[PDB]
Design a protein around this nucleic acid. Structure first.
Lengths: 338, 49, 48, 251, 50, 49, 48, 75
DNA sequence: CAACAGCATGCGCGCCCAGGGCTGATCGTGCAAAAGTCGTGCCAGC
DNA sequence: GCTGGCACGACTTTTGCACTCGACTAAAGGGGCGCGCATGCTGTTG
């Protein structure tokens, strides 16, 4: 309705909204505005990625309209407010961000064009042999690299994500004797509707009792003090109150339990039974696998088979494949550096 | 408005003929209200809440 | 194949706004398909 | 937009309770009559020639047991709003308007000479108009586009339902429950109470007035409805109509 | 008598927005009347010159 | 507890204090209001009170 | 300068360019009203 | 040459509502393009230019019609 | 004893803010067809 | 010949209709007003 501040909206501006605003105000032709609108949607909240170019060209359905037309227009779009916008590959991002250094920057212009244009793939590790490639030495190259490292990446300045999306918790786990104890914190027609409320008010009091109950059984199923969490099956919680698996997983999926470590509520009931006599499921396998891979490789061992042998020494019956596959995942440099 | 017994003339601004219509309301601290009134035809009536 | 204009589709020039009862058939002409369930947005997925 | 399909066509309280009642004065019935017999109460005998009972009359349930006892068949009386749809469907506009104007010609007292002219100018409006009277009580209920019912997002996340959404949720619950009990082939009592409950629900989604209480247990307040939804002051004052809040301005 | 005389205006859009909206729109919906846009409030609400 | 801290928290008769001026403080803390919980909904009160 | 969305844009772009010309359209809030009356079983449509 | 009062240009064309139409149709030309002022510019905006040309009697509805027919005939 | 005209009571307009306030949860009940992922083996690179 | 990546399989997880009846004792509000229109009961005209 009106005359009050109903949550009508804010109409904030994202990056694509703002870029399109910036396109509205620039001297594009009828067609070039179609290519521009075609590119600004391709852009991402991350900036740099304008995804595939030749799909931008082919998306228009031929009829002339070469590659060069989208290329020029593309450059000009890449030139709008947040300096380096879009482009591709980060290389051209840093070349567009480097396009304006005012040209009055000492030593930076040339060196920066050489480093940023080409050979930047080898600049990851360190200088080393690159120092011999560009003939530079001492701090001449190091100061240019200070500028290159001073650039930042793409957009993510427009952002428009003021919403942190907090957790709000649901049930509090007051820590007891090296464990956890639940408390669960935080005329006649409508009169007959009043009655439904009595039932809703009676169920509202038991809503906390379900959280404290399932929470108590969840604390009894997995040891808190132990590394990760003891392996459990939904059949235990389904054994206690005799509730269906999907229902319990739904309650733990919706609500989020706050313990002293982890905010992480439905992950405390999901585990494997390992299917082995000698033995914390995949939690400690992948967790402690990445932990053992954290301190290792004095220089560049890059050996996942040695880590698989170390896992087999612990009595987990490693397959040298599964263990290495789960260990090398999630950004793990293992086996990649070989 | 304090609890206890109250009286009102209505100032005969209803019936357009004019009268004196004397109604008495009892006001508790918490509970129902009893208000006795007069009819245009001069009969006492009881209202509850 | 593109040159796609949302702004240009409605220039519609009218006179006299008209009014009348809506038949169930005309209702179904407006209808995009039926809403069969009361719930709104899933609280997990954060999708409708 | 959207739409929802109703089991038993009900309400549309916008007509009928906006005085005067077009459904009342169209069918030559008092609004206590039709208002009384929309939900529950009487059975609203319709049609059924060759008997004691007339065309538009009502009766008590005990009089219905006596009716089916004596007359049996040839008395057809639909208790829900379908009798208003049936009666309303069987209304023949041309002949009735004509004989009513003729009847007006020989009349005398100015009292009866007014009502009649109201019915002539009404029914005549339906003829020249081209609307079917049936349409007044509605079957398919259209639903309002999503973005103009926004969801009132909270402080910590976890969006809470707006005021107008509650009415749609409610109607949908009663529609699904009346459909479920209707397809179940169950007694007329409970599905009857479901017809009642759903006319209450749709009439509450179109106007939270019309009768009493409405509201909720939310701290209550009448809530708001699509009627109330009309531009802040229930004029189009606000928002439009001379009243835009505005740009390049300061103070 | 000036409120009677507003509500009785030929254009169903004005006078709907004056006072009584339910009533107005019901007379208009049943009757099937067209606005013609001939006065100043209608033109405003549609957004056109007066 | 929820009833008591509900009162003092939120209530028409518990309001934030006027803290500019001493005399604002004072005159806030001796004030007699006709409004609230106990009566005088206003706009409907009339011109005699 | 309030609810015409395409027309606010065109307006401001012409101003930046020195045109000072309006290109007025139809304000949102009318459109809304037409949906909200369509939400009762009344059609209101704009006839040319 | 800021104009405080339009009366002088209103005697030229009756009903100012007409003046405003003619003033702005003439000013539009100089504003957007494809015209030059008939009167020496005093640095003023184009609107005042137009009202001055109306106050001088150089421009009016008939004159703009004759110029329109002349420009359409010459094109 | 008939219909007709009048007096009266009730109901719905207006005025006008008024403030929020909220609520999220919940709950299940089977069974069954389809799919995400961990495990194991096979093939290719060094 | 050894390690790492990926393909194939099983499992076990994900996902789709369709119902379930329960019920209890309050919680309060609450000093405008006009204006008009309609319904209803009364009353007097013949």
């Amino acid at each position: 309705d009106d005359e009050l501040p109903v949550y009508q909206g804010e109409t904030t501006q994202t990056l694509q909204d703002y870029l399109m605003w910036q396109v509205e105000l620039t001297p594009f032709t009828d067609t070039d505005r179609a290519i521009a609108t075609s590119i600004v949607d391709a852009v991402d909240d991350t900036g740099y990625l304008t995804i595939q170019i030749e799909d931008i060209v082919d998306s228009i359905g031929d009829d002339e309209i070469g590659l060069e037309e989208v290329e020029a227009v593309l450059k000009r779009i890449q030139r709008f407010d947040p300096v380096g916008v879009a482009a591709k590959d980060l290389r051209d991002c840093l070349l567009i961000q480097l396009s304006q250094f005012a040209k009055e920057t000492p030593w930076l212009e040339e060196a920066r064009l050489i480093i940023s244009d080409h050979l930047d793939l080898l600049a990851n590790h360190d200088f080393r042999t690159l120092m011999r490639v560009t003939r530079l030495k001492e701090e001449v190259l190091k100061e240019a690299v200070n500028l290159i490292q001073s650039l930042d990446x793409x957009x993510x300045x427009x952002x428009x994500x003021x919403x942190x999306x907090x957790x709000x918790x649901x049930x509090x786990x007051x820590x007891x004797x090296x464990x956890x104890x639940x408390x669960x914190x935080x005329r006649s027609n409508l009169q007959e509707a009043r009655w439904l409320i009595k039932s809703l008010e009676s169920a509202n009091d038991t809503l906390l009792r379900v959280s404290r109950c399932i929470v108590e059984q969840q604390q009894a199923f997995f040891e808190q003090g132990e590394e990760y969490m003891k392996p459990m099956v939904l059949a235990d919680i389904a054994q206690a109150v005799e509730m269906h698996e999907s229902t319990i997983s739904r309650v733990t999926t919706q609500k989020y339990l706050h313990s002293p470590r982890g905010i992480x509520x439905x992950x405390x009931x999901x585990x494997x039974x390992x299917x082995x006599x000698x033995x914390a499921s995949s939690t400690a396998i992948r967790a402690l696998v990445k932990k053992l891979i954290a301190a290792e490789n004095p220089a560049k061992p890059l050996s996942d088979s040695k880590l698989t042998s170390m896992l087999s020494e612990q009595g987990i019956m490693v397959a040298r494949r599964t263990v290495a596959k789960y260990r090398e995942s999630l950004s793990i440099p293992p086996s990649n550096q070989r | 408005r304090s609890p206890g017994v109250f009286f009102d003339s209505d100032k005969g601004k209803t019936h357009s003929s004019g009268k004196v219509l004397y109604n008495a309301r009892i006001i508790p601290y918490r509970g129902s209200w009893l208000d006795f009134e007069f009819d245009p035809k001069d009969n006492l009536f009881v209202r509850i809440d | 194949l593109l040159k796609f204009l949302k702004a240009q589709t409605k220039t519609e020039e009218f006179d006299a706004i008209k009014i009348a009862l809506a038949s169930p058939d005309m209702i179904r002409s407006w209808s995009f398909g039926e809403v069969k369930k009361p719930e709104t947005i899933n609280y997990r997925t954060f999708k409708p | 937009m959207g739409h929802i399909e109703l089991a038993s066509p009900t309400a549309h309280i916008w007509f009928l309770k906006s005085l005067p009642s077009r459904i009342g004065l169209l069918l030559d019935m008092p609004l206590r009559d039709i208002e009384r017999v929309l939900y529950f109460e009487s059975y609203v005998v319709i049609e059924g020639g060759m008997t004691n009972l007339e065309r538009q009359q009502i009766l008590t349930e005990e009089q219905y047991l006596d009716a089916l006892e004596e007359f049996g068949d040839e008395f057809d009386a639909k208790m829900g709003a379908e009798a208003i749809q049936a009666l309303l469907k069987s209304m023949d506009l041309e002949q009735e308007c004509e004989q009513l104007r003729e009847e007006l010609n020989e009349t005398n007292s100015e009292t009866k000479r007014k009502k009649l002219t109201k019915r002539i100018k009404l029914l005549e409006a339906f003829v020249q108009s081209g609307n079917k009277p049936e349409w007044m009580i509605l079957t398919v209920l259209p639903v309002l586009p999503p973005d103009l019912r926004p969801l009132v997002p909270l402080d910590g996340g976890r969006f809470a339902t707006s005021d107008l959404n509650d009415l749609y949720r409610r109607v949908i619950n009663r529609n699904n429950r009346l459909k479920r009990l209707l397809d179940l082939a169950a007694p007329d009592i409970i599905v009857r109470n479901e017809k009642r409950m759903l006319q209450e629900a749709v009439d509450a989604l179109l106007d939270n007035g019309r009768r009493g209480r409405a509201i909720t247990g939310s701290n209550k307040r009448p809530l708001k409805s699509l009627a109330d939804m009309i531009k802040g002051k229930q004029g189009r004052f606000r928002q439009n109509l001379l009243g835009k809040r505005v740009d390049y301005s300061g103070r | 008598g000036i409120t009677k005389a507003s509500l009785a205006t030929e254009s169903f859009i004005s006078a709907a927005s004056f006072q009584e909206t339910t009533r107005v729109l019901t007379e208009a919906a049943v009757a099937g009347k067209r606005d013609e846009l001939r006065g100043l409030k209608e033109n405003v609400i549609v957004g056109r010159l007066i | 507890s929820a009833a008591v801290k509900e009162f003092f928290g939120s209530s028409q008769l518990s309001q934030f204090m006027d803290q500019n001026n001493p005399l604002s403080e004072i005159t806030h803390k001796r004030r007699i209001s006709a409004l609230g919980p106990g009566g005088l909904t206003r706009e409907r009160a009339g011109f005699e009170v | 300068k309030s609810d015409d969305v395409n027309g606010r844009t065109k307006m401001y772009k012409n101003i930046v360019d020195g045109n000072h010309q309006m290109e007025p359209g139809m304000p949102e809030s009318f459109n809304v009203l037409l949906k909200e009356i369509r939400s009762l079983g009344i059609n209101i449509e704009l006839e040319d | 040459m800021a104009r405080v009062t339009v009366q002088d240009a209103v005697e030229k064309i009756g009903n100012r509502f007409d003046l405003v139409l003619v003033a702005a149709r003439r000013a539009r030309q100089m504003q957007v393009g494809g015209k030059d002022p008939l009167v020496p510019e005093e640095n003023d905006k184009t609107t005042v230019i137009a009202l001055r040309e109306i106050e001088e009697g150089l421009i009016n509805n008939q004159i703009l019609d004759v110029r329109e027919r002349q420009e359409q005939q010459e094109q």
